[PDB]
Amino acid sequence: EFLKPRLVDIEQVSSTHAKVTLEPLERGFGHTLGNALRRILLSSMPGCAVTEVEIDGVLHEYSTKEGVQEDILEILLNLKGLAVRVQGKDEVILTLNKSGIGPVTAADITHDGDVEIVKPQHVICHLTDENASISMRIKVQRGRGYVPASTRIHSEEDERPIGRLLVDACYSPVERIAYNVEAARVEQRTDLDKLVIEMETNGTIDPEEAIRRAATILAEQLEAFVDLRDV
Amino acid sequence: VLKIVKVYLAVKRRIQPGDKMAGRHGNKGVISKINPIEDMPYDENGTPV
Numbered sequence: 479e480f481l482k483p484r485l486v487d488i489e490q491v492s493s494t495h496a497k498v499t500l501e502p503l504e505r506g507f508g509h510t511l512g513n514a515l516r517r518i519l520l521s522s523m524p525g526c527a528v529t530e531v532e533i534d535g536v537l538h539e540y541s542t543k544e545g546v547q548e549d550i551l552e553i554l555l556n557l558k559g560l561a562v563r564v565q566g567k568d569e570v571i572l573t574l575n576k577s578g579i580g581p582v583t584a585a586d587i588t589h590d591g592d593v594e595i596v597k598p599q600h601v602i603c604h605l606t607d608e609n610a611s612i613s614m615r616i617k618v619q620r621g622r623g624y625v626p627a628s629t630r631i632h633s634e635e636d637e638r639p640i641g642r643l644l645v646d647a648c649y650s651p652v653e654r655i656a657y658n659v660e661a662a663r664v665e666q667r668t669d670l671d672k673l674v675i676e677m678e679t680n681g682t683i684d685p686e687e688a689i690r691r692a693a694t695i696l697a698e699q700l701e702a703f704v705d706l707r708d709v
Numbered sequence: 710v711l712k713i714v715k716v717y718l719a720v721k722r723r724i725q726p727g728d729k730m731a732g733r734h735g736n737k738g739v740i741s742k743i744n745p746i747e748d749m750p751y752d753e754n755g756t757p758v
Binding site for chain 1: 719723745746747751753754755756
């Protein structure tokens with residue numbers, strides 16, 4: 479004798495911001511599910527992000543190119559924010575080649591099939607010289623959580639090329655999560671609740687898939703709970 | 710002395726537990742723990758501190 483929640487309308491206010499509703503929630507489970515999902519989403523949502531970059535004329539993060547105004551280090555800091563969606567492969571190599579005066583945005587990346595650049599207006603660099611040209615090859619991986627360079631250094635795995643520029647990996651698409659449990663007047667019932675999850679992401683994971691995967695992870699851990707050895 | 714060779718190392722030091730942080734008003738402290746985003750308090754809107 480229970481009720482159970484069914485995923486209902488998923489409002490999209492912006493490309494990044496989304497509201498997801500769950501209508502038939504039993505009394506008391508509003509907050510339980512809200513918080514469990516909030517935790518899972520903020521912690522464990524898999525995403526793809528840039529791990530390392532190779533630019534031609536630059537030995538290390540601290541040098542500088544002719545005809546650009548950002549330092550190379552600031553270029554990496556801008557790349558960390560690059561929101562990208564990878565579909566099939568786990569590690570993709572994007573290529574950015576731009577010349578002439580203008581802001582090098584993410585749109586200028588060489589368009590590959592499997593990779594989606596979510597925010598093409600996202601700036602990367604600014605050239606300032608007619609003959610100034612920037613080329614770089616950005617390696618993008620899939621992962622969960624947050625992995626810094628210094629930890630992966632244990633697993634260097636032939637980092638020998640001095641042209642390599644390691645970037646801190648924020649393998650996480652979800653930026654913000656809030657939930658409200660509010661009275662869900664069901665036509666034949668007195669006291670039922672609806673959970674409304676408002677989530678702000680970098681626009682790679684879709685809301686439906688995020689919620690489904692989070693529920694999946696929580697359910698798997700619950701599976702771990704169902705059996706108890708006691709042996 | 711015939712000759713000298715100087716080498717500059719640059720190191721990016723990230724904040725970690727034990728570093729000292731302060732305000733402008735005389736408040737001090739040692740960074741005691743790095744919490745995951747989910748554990749941190751959050752307002753109704755969902756923004757964590």
